[PDB]
């Protein structure tokens, strides 16, 4: 007789450093005498040697230009003239996923909305045919993919609900959601991040941020329901502020927000971007109660503990460096991108990238000095801060009619890929030239020197 | 020391010279050097070159305003579009970006370029443009002040709410379910908040309606999920399809007909149990 | 029936197996690979000359 | 995840199907038993039963197979094994 | 006694790494952080098990005494004995 | 080596035989090829055919198996998968 | 040109090993017998694959550029590329 069996290797155990008194320390000392005699000779030779002056090796083809052939769209969404801004890449690097909703005048979304997923590894990949599709009866605009399970994606809605999909069961692709409760958002949402469960960090929770001026942390239990455990509000008087801001109006008014980026070496620290045009530093441990009129099952608090120098108007994107803990980039309505250190209130650098509106900023997963940005003129741009202090290194025109373009994300594991989305219901995927794809000489040291150059 | 430094400055300026953005950003980065009188006399053609770039930039900013100022909000011929902003809020953000670039153009030219005869002529033009942006923004706020106060008077449309006005209504003339909180009041909370966040003073009457509208906004969004679920499950079914689902819907519809905080939140709690059943059966017909 | 062994990572590019060569034609002949022998032997020669200058 | 391969005995449609089903398994799951579960379940459904599938990034194997049915492949930083026996 | 030698090795020209690992595979104190120390100690321990086999596989009457790896970011040095092996890292020059 | 075990369907003698055959191979050979090779060859020699073996620090699987023959087990850092079908 | 460069290395003080490898563990140039050439070629190819893997597990944004291996009887030196690699062997110093 035949039966079917499933088995899995558990996760690796982490090793620990050992304290010295436990072992025979004189044998470590005798070892270090022998080894230092050689290592002194060999480190002096390696400091001295000419043996690698201009030496190089190759492991990839030297593709000369940022170049592309993909076009991803859902024709039933495109026939309605719907606009797109969402990208996320899954943990297996197999999927890119996208979401349709018109932002055009912020008008009332009783209109149809779709979430689409494309698996770019498929030999059955086609331009006009998503690998999966799910509908929502009001506009969706976020996606974030779970840091381990590749099917699991979370997104926020116009009119305030949060939805979580699992693309591993496509006959029932969607059950983890707020419904509506006192805990919830109300005005348009667009951020998601996935964050580990405190003390149980192999599990994950969904974070949401909204034009409400709330920040919320969520988990799913049972049929059609999420439950909450951290809640913050940007009550306008309460946050500490820089001198470009006047004495603030009624604290019973929030400041609305949409950005999140975490300082990846110390997960308490996150950065927010605001409707008021000022970046904020936020801590997951700020205890000051908000005094918001509205009820919630957990009471709201101020999330923030610092304010940075402002943009010329609303902020729509922020991203933090995966190489230096203190660094973030912001993009907003004023045609500029700014760099900040989390130690200082002025920007470390300011650049103008268009005469028109912008919203994307992302850092390369490979290169400490590469950032990318995208523009309402219909263009995508890449900047190599090791090659120039002032000039953008690459510019790409995505829409032939100059209809607006706004998304950026870099792939999780095929790190040569960058994807961008636009007003003609479409996403395109760009493979970068090799100079972007592989790390340059001394780039980590040059990023430390960049931050140090205006330590003030 | 300045003469040898100015030689290297004039070389660096000649490397960047093709780009007006790089030229202007170098003139900002090294502004305090360019201010000094001997360096200013060494860089005279470079000062006149930046004046020509900035004069053309003031032409382009006014030409963009001349096309846009009576064009449709958000459209490519009119004011630019941000994420989820309204007609008035897009218009204000767009005007302040024109003010910002004209003001920076004036300030940088004032410190660096104000010896030149063309600077007097073009400074007058740039200041006059900047005052015309202020004036046209004030004309939009004068119209907004009238038109918000007249709109708020029509509370029966849902542009403002009496607490003694109706929660939700199954209008037997139509069979449709209606919620008396207008979509324009949800936009008014976004408008008043975004104005406050950027830094505007809010009129007392507008703040009073916003207080009433905030607490009702939580309820109105719940009521609009119910109303859109009822209107969509009705529109999915021609009468040839209804009576079978209508038995399950009659549990949810008893709560809707009972529309004819503690009352409403207990009503919503019962309605969410009915919604688990009805939403499961809605997917089966789809 | 046929028997196969297979591994990740591999003990070579012969990743799996069952119970002169054509690859040499491009590999010996390629002028880029001949240049990589100029470079790699230049590295070996300066390493030997540095080790002799330290020894002598 | 780009592919790298060295083994050869199955018909070309079966090579196409096995890489495609594993690709769909990479959108479907990361927990490797579930990736292998998709790959095997579609192969048992389309082809004659019974099939065996394994997914790992640190393993060795030795297995025996029916004529014209075996594949082994690398996708990115992971390896996949799929064969019929019984 | 020992920690003074660790400062002597930390002081070297163009250098920032030290890790010592024991023949059981377990790390000793480092100027790197614990995440980085764990990653380097475990990975290089696996690589040195292959290295010492490789020299013994060329000749069972021989044995291994030093190793280098040069990489695009940095050079790495390795030095094994009876109870311990050392890792050192030198920034690019 | 320390032995740790979980998911199985076989008589206790066959469980112990898998642990001993793997242990003796792990002493005899440093390379996983020869471990998986010996485990199959001894199972084919003592038992009736047909057997398949996997030996790894990381894998997940889905497989078909015959009643009273399946095991998965650990010997230190390494896991082993061993099943009958064919 | 290149053959004279291999003869130059073959002549050096206490030197005799030169092998070039096709990235299938098999040799294309040698100053040694083919059986021993294949032993060193296949062992070094296994060891390069583990070395490159180890550097990418240490830092996925880095990559391997050189390997050096010192034994009580001799030192071995290795210079790798995608398609092709050189092995050289010398008495200790």
* Sequence spans of domains, chain E: 1-93
Scan residues 57-86 of A and list those with Cβ closer than 8 Å to B.
85
Please give the structure tokens belonging to residue E64.
């291994």
Alpha carbon distance C19, C33 (integer Å): 35
Domain hosting D27: range is 2-86
Scan residues 2-41 of C and list those with Cβ closer than 8 Å to G.
9-14, 21, 23-24, 27-28, 30, 33-34, 36-38, 40-41
Find all residues with CB under 8 Å of E6, minimum gap 6, and list them: E18, E29, E31
DSSP string, A94-148: -EEEEEE---TT-----S-EEEEEEETT-TT-BTTB-SEEEEESS-B---EE-SS
Q: Do F52 and D52 touch (CB under 8 A)?
A: yes
Helix (H) or strand (E) holding B275: helix B262-285
Alpha carbon distance A427, C51 (integer Å): 58
Alpha carbon distance A122, A131 (integer Å): 9
B130 and B103 Cβ atoms separated by less than 8 Å: yes
Please give the structure tokens belonging to residue A158.
């116009």
Minimal Cβ distance to G8: which of C30, C45, C55: C45
Q: Do B97 and A108 touch (CB under 8 A)?
A: no
Asked if B232 has any chain A CB less than 8 Å from its own CB, the reply is yes
D83 and D63 Cβ atoms separated by less than 8 Å: yes
Residue E59 with chain G: CB contacts under 8 Å = 71, 73
What was the elucidation method? cryo-EM
Nearest-CA distance G88 → chain A (Å): 15
Residue G82 with chain A: CB contacts under 8 Å = 58-60
Please give the structure tokens belonging to residue A89.
């890449």
Please give the structure tokens belonging to residue B62.
């006014």
- Go through chain C and tell me how many residues it has: 56
Q: Do A43 and E84 touch (CB under 8 A)?
A: no
Minimal Cβ distance to A211: which of B84, B100, B279: B84
Minimal Cβ distance to A9: which of F62, F79, F85: F79
Find all residues with CB under 8 Å of D82, minimum gap 6, and list them: D18, D22, D39, D40, D43, D51, D52, D53, D54, D70, D71, D72
Interface test with G, best of A38, A50, A57 (most G CBs within 10 A): A57
Helix (H) or strand (E) holding F24: helix F12-28
Chain D residues whose C-beta is within 8 A of a chain C C-beta are 6-7, 9, 56-67, 70, 72, 74, 78-79, 81, 83, 85
Nearest to D62 by CA among F81, A229, A148: F81
Q: Do E65 and G72 touch (CB under 8 A)?
A: yes
Alpha carbon distance A381, A401 (integer Å): 18
Decide: helix, strand or coil at residue G27. strand
Torsion, CA B155, CA B158, CA B159, CA B165, rounded to 10:
40
Residue F83 with chain A: CB contacts under 8 Å = 5
Q: Residue D65's Cα: distance from chain center in Å? A: 13
Q: D–F: how many Cβ contacts below 8 A?
A: 103
- Dmax (CA) for chain B in angstroms is 94
Strands F3-10 and A409-410: unpaired
Q: Do A17 and E8 touch (CB under 8 A)?
A: no
Asked if C47 has any chain A CB less than 8 Å from its own CB, the reply is yes
Count the domains in chain C: 1
Q: What is the CATH number of the domain that holds D65?
A: 3.30.740.10
Asked if A49 has any chain C CB less than 8 Å from its own CB, the reply is yes
Please give the structure tokens belonging to residue G46.
């296994």
Scan residues 250-289 of A and list those with Cβ closer than 8 Å to G.
none
Nearest to D27 by CA among F65, B46, A117, B109: A117
Asked if E61 has any chain A CB less than 8 Å from its own CB, the reply is no
Alpha carbon distance A207, A223 (integer Å): 20
Minimal Cβ distance to F36: which of C1, C5, C11: C5
Q: Within a 10 A sphere around the Cβ of B143, how many other Cβ atoms?
A: 11
Please give the structure tokens belonging to residue A126.
């086609």
* Cα separations in angstroms, B217 against A186, A410, B85, D73: 8, 38, 18, 56
Nearest to F3 by CA among F69, F77, F56: F77
Alpha carbon distance B22, B15 (integer Å): 10
Between helices F32-46 and F12-28, what is the axis angle to 10°?
140
Q: Do G61 and A57 touch (CB under 8 A)?
A: no
Residue C1 with chain F: CB contacts under 8 Å = 50, 86
Nearest-CA distance A31 → chain E (Å): 7
Q: What would be the CATH architecture of the domain defined by G1-93?
A: 2-Layer Sandwich (3.30)
Count the domains in chain D: 1
Residue with tokens 């923030």: A304
Helix (H) or strand (E) holding E68: strand E64-71
Give resolution in angstroms. 4.0
Q: Do D6 and C13 touch (CB under 8 A)?
A: yes
Nearest-CA distance G7 → chain E (Å): 24
Please give the structure tokens belonging to residue A132.
């999966």
E92 and E74 Cβ atoms separated by less than 8 Å: yes
Nearest to E52 by CA among E22, E83, E80, E10: E80
Residue C18 with chain F: CB contacts under 8 Å = none
Q: Give, rounded to a whole angstrom, the gap between the first and last alpha carbons of chain C.
A: 65
Residue C15 with chain D: CB contacts under 8 Å = 6-7, 72, 74
Whether C10 maps to a domain, the answer reads: no
Interface test with C, best of D56, D57, D64 (most C CBs within 10 A): D64
Q: Do D56 and F54 touch (CB under 8 A)?
A: yes
Minimal Cβ distance to F67: which of A1, A6, A8: A1
**Closest alpha carbon within chain G to C48:** G12
Alpha carbon distance A406, A420 (integer Å): 7
């Amino acid at each position: 007789n035949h039966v079917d069996a499933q088995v899995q290797t558990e996760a690796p155990v982490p090793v620990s450093v050992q304290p010295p008194s436990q072992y025979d320390i004189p044998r470590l000392a005798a070892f270090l005498r022998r080894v230092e005699a050689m290592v002194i000779r060999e480190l002096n030779k390696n400091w001295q040697s000419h043996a690698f002056d201009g030496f190089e090796v190759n492991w990839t083809e030297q593709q000369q230009m940022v170049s592309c052939l993909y076009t991803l769209g859902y024709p039933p969404a495109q026939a309605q003239g719907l606009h797109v801004t969402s990208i996320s890449w899954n943990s297996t690097g197999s999927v890119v996923a996208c979401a349709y909703g018109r932002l055009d005048h912020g008008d009332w979304s009783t209109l149809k909305s779709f979430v689409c997923a494309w698996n770019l590894d498929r030999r059955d990949l086609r331009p006009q045919q998503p690998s999966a599709v799910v509908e929502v009866p009001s506009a969706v605009l976020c996606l974030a993919f779970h840091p381990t399970q590749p099917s699991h994606v979370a997104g926020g809605l116009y009119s305030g609900e949060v939805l979580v999909w699992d693309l591993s069961r496509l006959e029932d692709p969607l059950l983890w959601r707020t419904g509506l409760t006192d805990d919830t958002h109300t005005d348009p949402v667009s951020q998601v991040v996935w964050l580990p469960e405190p003390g149980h960090s192999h599990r994950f929770q969904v974070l949401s941020v909204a034009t409400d001026g709330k920040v919320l942390l969520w988990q799913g239990i049972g049929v059609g329901q999420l439950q909450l455990t951290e809640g913050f509000a940007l009550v306008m008087q309460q946050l500490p502020r820089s001198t470009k801001l006047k004495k603030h109006p009624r604290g019973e008014t929030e400041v609305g927000a949409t950005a999140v980026a975490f300082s990846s070496f110390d997960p308490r620290l996150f950065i927010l971007g605001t409707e008021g045009g000022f970046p904020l530093k936020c801590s997951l441990a700020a205890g000051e109660a908000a005094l918001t009129r509205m009820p919630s099952s957990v009471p709201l608090r101020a999330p923030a503990q610092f304010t940075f120098s402002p943009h010329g108007g609303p902020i729509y994107s922020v991203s933090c460096s995966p190489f230096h803990r203190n660094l973030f980039l912001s993009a907003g309505t004023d045609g500029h991108v700014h760099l900040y250190s989390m130690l200082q209130a002025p920007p470390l650098t300011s650049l103008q990238l268009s005469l028109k509106y912008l919203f994307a900023v992302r850092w390369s997963p490979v290169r400490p000095l590469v950032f990318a940005a995208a523009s309402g003129k219909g263009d995508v741009q890449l900047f190599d801060l090791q090659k120039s202090s002032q000039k953008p290194t690459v510019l790409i025109k995505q829409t032939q009619d100059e209809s607006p373009v706004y998304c950026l994300e870099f792939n999780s594991q095929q790190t040569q890929l960058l994807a961008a989305g636009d007003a003609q219901g479409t996403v395109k995927v760009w493979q970068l030239s090799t100079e972007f794809t592989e790390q340059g000489p001394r780039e980590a040291e040059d990023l430390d020197c960049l931050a140090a150059e205006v330590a003030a | 020391a300045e003469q040898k430094i100015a030689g290297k400055l004039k070389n660096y300026i000649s490397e960047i010279q093709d780009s007006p953005q790089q030229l202007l950003q170098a003139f900002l980065k090294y502004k305090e050097l360019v201010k000094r009188p001997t360096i200013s006399k060494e860089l005279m053609l470079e000062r006149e070159t930046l004046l020509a770039r900035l004069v053309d930039s003031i032409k382009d900013f006014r030409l963009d305003f001349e096309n846009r100022c009576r064009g449709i909000p958000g459209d490519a011929s009119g004011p630019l579009s941000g994420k989820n902003l309204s007609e008035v809020v897009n218009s204000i953000v767009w005007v302040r970006q024109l003010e910002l670039k004209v003001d920076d153009t004036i300030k940088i030219a004032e410190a660096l370029l104000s010896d030149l005869p063309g600077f007097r002529c073009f400074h007058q033009s740039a200041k006059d443009l900047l005052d015309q942006l202020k004036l046209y923004e004030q004309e939009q706020f004068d119209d907004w002040s009238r038109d918000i106060q007249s709109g708020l008077s029509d509370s029966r449309s849902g542009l403002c709410i009496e607490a003694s006005s109706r929660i939700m209504e199954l209008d037997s003339n139509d069979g449709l379910l209606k919620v008396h909180y207008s979509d324009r009041l949800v936009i008014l909370l976004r408008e008043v908040r975004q104005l406050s966040a950027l830094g505007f003073v809010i009129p007392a009457k507008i703040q009073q309606v916003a207080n009433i509208a905030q607490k009702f906004c939580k309820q109105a969004i719940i009521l609009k999920q119910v109303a859109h679920f009822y209107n969509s499950i009705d529109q999915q079914m021609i009468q040839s399809q209804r009576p079978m689902m209508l038995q399950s819907a009659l549990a949810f519809e008893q709560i809707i007909k009972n529309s004819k905080p503690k009352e409403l939140e207990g009503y919503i709690q019962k309605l969410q149990n009915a919604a688990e059943r009805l939403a499961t059966e809605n997917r089966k017909l789809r | 029936t046929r028997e196969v062994w297979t591994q990740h990572p591999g003990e070579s590019t012969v990743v799996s197996g069952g119970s002169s060569d054509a690859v040499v034609m491009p590999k010996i002949d390629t002028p880029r690979l001949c240049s990589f022998l100029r470079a790699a032997c230049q590295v070996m020669a300066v390493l030997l000359e540095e080790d002799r200058l330290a020894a002598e | 995840r780009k592919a790298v391969i060295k083994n050869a005995d199955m018909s070309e449609e079966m090579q196409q199907d096995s890489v495609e089903c594993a690709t769909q398994a990479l959108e479907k799951y990361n927990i490797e038993k579930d990736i292998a579960a998709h790959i095997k379940k579609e192969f048992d459904k389309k082809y004659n039963p019974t099939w065996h599938c394994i997914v790992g990034r640190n393993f060795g194997s030795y297995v025996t197979h029916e004529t014209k049915h075996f594949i082994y492949f690398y996708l990115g930083q992971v390896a996949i094994l799929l064969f019929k026996s019984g | 006694e020992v920690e003074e030698t660790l400062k002597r090795l930390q002081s070297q020209k163009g250098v920032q790494g030290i890790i010592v690992v024991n023949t059981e595979g377990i790390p000793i104190k480092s100027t790197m952080d614990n995440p980085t120390t764990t990653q380097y100690a475990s990975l290089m321990h696996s690589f040195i098990l292959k290295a010492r086999s490789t020299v013994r596989d060329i000749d069972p009457q021989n044995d291994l005494t030093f190793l280098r790896i040069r990489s695009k970011k940095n050079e790495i040095m390795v030095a094994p004995d009876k109870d311990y092996f050392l890792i050192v890292i030198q920034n690019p020059t």
